[PDB]
């Protein structure tokens, strides 16, 4: 769970997995289900590819440098609505009530 | 100005839409059903052959018009249509 | 603790013609025509961008 | 245009009384033709092999007994007797018409489309060897014929070289119906100016 | 009168027109008192399950069927037949088709009718076990269904290309 | 005569053995395809060139301009645009 | 006794037959109605037919590629046998199954259309737009209140 929360991509296979957990991939792909299974995780497993495609993290304890993470990004989305905005009065000028 | 506003979850509302899959349907359904007042409005104007106005709207029924329901059919879908991509555009690029 | 819910208008007949009898205004709350969407749409991203 | 022949010819065959017009020998012939061109297999099943009315009449006439052949052997996925039985309509019943002797040309060109088509629409691969075995040309013979027919997009196939193999491709679907409108809509948009501004005029 | 009518209109593949006459016909039988009408009784009674599998009515032959009228007073080799193709055709196997019409053989010789449908038959259930087999597969090996069918390999490619 | 060729034969192919560049570029030294090489801006590494880095990052510096990529035409934009012309 | 074997089904944990059976053979099993006697050890067997097919309801849901060679091993059958079972499962329209018989893929993905998708993405934008609001409340609180 730890590994797939602190990391922000989506997908490990089984390789990166089997070193971590001191497992064999044939019982990696059980422990993957398991995980799912109990509400830690979701997402789906492929065997022709050996991904498993995470989708789902379970919020945990927030820790103060968490919380300035989020807000950089609220920041990013601000302004592109304020910009868009600006636009969309130029346009339209004459129609509106 | 308290009554003028009587909304609040207006600015939510105006940034959602509906499941996609009944759009399409109001999409078929207005273009199938302006085929089928189409077909009359051709017969219309083999007419239109009667002196006054409203000697035309007794005599062959001219007030149960073709013109005025494929005119506002087409004005509803369209106006629909507008406002669908407008907001669809919106969201993706506004939102990511 | 205190939850919120939505607060909206119903309003009867009478109650309903003695506000449009006070207002000169033809709302724009309504989303009705294709003008009165536009002015939403705009007031829908400046909702947005306040909160 | 023999999209409106056909839903005709189909109802003179059980009924007409002949009123200064040709036998209903050259009816039953001129619905045959015009059958395989307009309708798929189905259709063409029903309408035309299963007429009670073709049946009854028989095959009595040297253009009526070439048409009927080259219908059963579309239908049959024969193909070794598609060819010809195609080369003998074209002698025995397009020429002695007076109304497919001038559309001949256009008519043999559509035939030669349909039953590589028919072969390709079923086939995802086919070896050039293989497909020209089971029509009886040579091989050269057909690799002309195939590559004449490509840029007129009915046929829908690349033909490969190296290994001999045709890989039948098929862009045919929503985007086919997007072709089509702008074009149409195009032509739409010509007539609504010329019209238009000759009357504003006055 | 009305069986005669039923037998022919059989024949020119409507199997509506078909059952009603022979229901009509096997009334009269059922409740008339037996002498060499249980012969007549019988050859009905046959063409009378007989439409219905045409038609893929499959349930419709069972329903015709009971444990106190048709199985009891008129059970006979032709009925258990019958009741046989039926369960062939729910499962949509050609096996089992195969193994009812292998061993009822001079059954199926013994009426025309009941034979040039069987030859009609064969076929539109071909293609209904063709059909099975692959809709649970996708990029289906041309080897494994011609073990299936039973037919020789060149010939499940040119049955295949007509479906 | 040699650059028009150059520029075709980016978007040709991608890569080419050394003997048949110099073929197409006319040159009778091998070495004398790799000095146009460097001129042009393009890698030959074991006698083989690529364009799979270079076409696109030439395409892309001469690209960028702040003229006409404020220009676009939006999917907003013109559904804006249409909007107008039906009310007035 | 009772609680384990509906703890079983109830999880959506698959499990492998030999197992289920060998467990549970001396204290369910032995019991009257359903299983003991004699015509009542013919119903024993029609319950490796749900273990199996349970096993596939099971991957269906958690796997979407899966090969053909790893599912013959967990349902533990051989080749022949496990096409028909997913055959007969998808008979009943319990599953989607697609299996390739060259032993590429068994594909358990739904099918997607373009109107599907649409609504999905649709779900997820409204979302996102009542829980701003949500946590807005939440925000007046603790703001005035410390």
């Known amino acids: 769970i730890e590994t797939v929360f602190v990391k922000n991509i989506r997908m490990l296979s089984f390789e990166d997995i089997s070193k971590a957990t001191h497992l064999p991939k044939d019982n990696v792909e059980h422990l993957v289900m398991r995980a799912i299974s109990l509400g830690l995780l979701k997402g789906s497993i492929d065997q022709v590819n050996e991904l498993v495609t995470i989708s789902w993290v379970q919020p945990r304890i927030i820790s103060g440098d968490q919380i300035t993470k989020m807000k950089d990004r609220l920041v990013e989305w601000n302004d592109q609505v304020e910009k868009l905005g600006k636009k969309m009065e130029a346009r339209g000028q004459s129609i509106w009530v | 100005k308290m009554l003028m506003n009587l909304h609040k979850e207006q600015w939510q509302s105006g940034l959602k839409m509906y499941d996609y899959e009944e759009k399409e349907e109001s999409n078929l359904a207005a273009t199938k059903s302006m085929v089928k007042i189409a077909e009359q409005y051709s017969k219309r104007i083999e007419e239109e052959k009667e002196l006054t106005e409203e000697e035309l709207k007794t005599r062959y029924v001219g007030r149960q018009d073709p013109k005025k329901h494929l005119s506002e059919t087409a004005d509803e879908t369209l106006e629909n249509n507008i406002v669908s991509v407008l907001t669809a555009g919106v969201n993706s690029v506004a939102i990511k | 603790t205190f939850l919120h819910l939505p607060c909206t208008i119903e309003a009867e007949e009478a109650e309903e013609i003695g506000v449009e009898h006070l207002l000169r205004d033809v709302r724009d709350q309504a989303a009705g025509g294709l003008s009165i969407r536009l002015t939403n749409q705009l007031k829908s991203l400046k909702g947005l961008q306040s909160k | 245009n023999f999209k409106e022949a056909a839903k005709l010819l189909v109802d003179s065959l059980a009924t ?67 060819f010809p039985y195609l080369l003998e309509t074209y002698a025995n019943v397009l020429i002695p018409c007076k109304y497919l002797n001038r559309h001949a040309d256009f008519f043999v060109r559509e ?6 088509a028919q072969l390709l629409e079923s086939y995802k691969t086919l070896s050039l060897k293989s497909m020209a075995s089971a029509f009886g040309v040579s091989v050269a013979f057909l690799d002309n014929d195939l590559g004449k027919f490509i840029p007129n997009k009915q046929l829908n196939c690349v033909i490969d070289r190296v290994n001999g193999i045709v890989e039948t491709n098929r862009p045919d679907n929503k985007n086919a119906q997007y072709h089509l409108l702008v074009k149409q809509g195009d032509g739409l948009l010509t007539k609504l100016q010329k019209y238009g501004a000759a009357v504003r005029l006055t | 009168l009305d069986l005669m009518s039923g037998i022919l209109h059989c024949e020119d593949k409507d199997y509506k027109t078909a059952f009603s006459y022979f229901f009509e016909s096997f009334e009269s039988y059922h409740n008339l008192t037996t002498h060499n009408s249980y012969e007549k009784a019988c050859q009905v009674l046959k063409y009378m399950l007989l439409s219905k599998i045409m038609l893929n009515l499959i349930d419709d032959v069972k329903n015709i069927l009971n444990a106190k009228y048709t199985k009891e007073t008129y059970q006979s080799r032709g009925i258990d037949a019958m009741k ?51 809709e649970p597969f996708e990029c289906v090996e041309i080897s494994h269904i011609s073990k299936i069918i039973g037919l020789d390999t060149q010939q499940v490619e040119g049955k295949l290309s007509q479906m | 005569i040699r650059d028009e060729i150059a520029k075709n034969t980016e978007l040709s192919y991608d890569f080419l053995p050394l003997s048949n560049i110099k073929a197409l570029l006319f040159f009778n030294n091998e070495k004398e395809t790799e000095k146009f090489a460097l001129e042009r801006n393009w890698p030959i590494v074991n006698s083989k060139v690529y364009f799979n880095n270079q076409s696109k990052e030439k395409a892309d510096y001469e690209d960028e301009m702040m003229h006409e990529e404020d220009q676009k035409t939006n999917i907003i934009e013109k559904a804006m645009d249409y909007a107008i012309s039906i009310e007035n | ?30 019991d009257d109605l359903a299983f003991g006697g004699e015509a009542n050890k013919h119903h024993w067997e029609d319950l490796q037919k749900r273990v199996i097919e349970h096993n596939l309801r099971v991957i269906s849901e958690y796997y979407s590629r899966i090969t053909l060679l790893r599912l013959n091993e967990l349902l533990d059958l051989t080749e022949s046998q496990t096409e028909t079972y997913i055959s007969d499962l998808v ?20 099918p997607k259309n373009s109107s599907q998708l649409l609504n999905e993405w649709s779900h997820n934008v409204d979302e996102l737009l009542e829980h701003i609001e949500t946590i807005g409340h939440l925000i007046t609180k603790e703001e005035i209140m410390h």
């Not at chain 4, 035939?111 to 590589?116: D, I, T």
């Not at chain 5, 195969?98 to 001079?106: F, R």
């Open chain 4, 16 to 82: 007409f009384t002949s009123i200064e017009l040709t036998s209903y020998e050259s009816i039953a012939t001129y619905a045959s033709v015009t059958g395989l061109f307009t309708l798929e297999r189905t259709d063409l099943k029903s309408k035309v092999i299963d007429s009670p009315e073709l049946l009854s009449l028989i095959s009595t006439t040297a253009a009526l007994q070439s048409i009927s052949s080259l219908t059963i052997s579309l239908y049959a996925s024969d193909y070794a007797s598609y």
């Open chain 4, 111 to 116: 035939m030669r489309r349909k039953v590589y």
């Open chain 5, 84 to 134: 046989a193709v039926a369960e062939a055709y729910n499962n949509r196997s050609l096996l089992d088709f195969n193994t009812a019409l292998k061993q009822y053989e001079k059954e199926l010789m013994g009426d025309e009718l009941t034979r040039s449908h069987f030859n009609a038959l064969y076929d539109t259930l071909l293609e209904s076990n063709l059909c099975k087999i692959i």
């Open chain 7, 1 to 30: 006794s009772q609680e384990s074997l509906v703890k079983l089904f109830t999880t959506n944990e698959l499990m492998r037959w030999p197992i289920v059976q060998k467990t549970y053979e001396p204290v369910l099993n032995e």
């Open chain 7, 91 to 110: 008979n009943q329209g319990i599953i989607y199954a697609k299996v390739n018989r060259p032993a590429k893929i068994v594909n358990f993905e739904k």
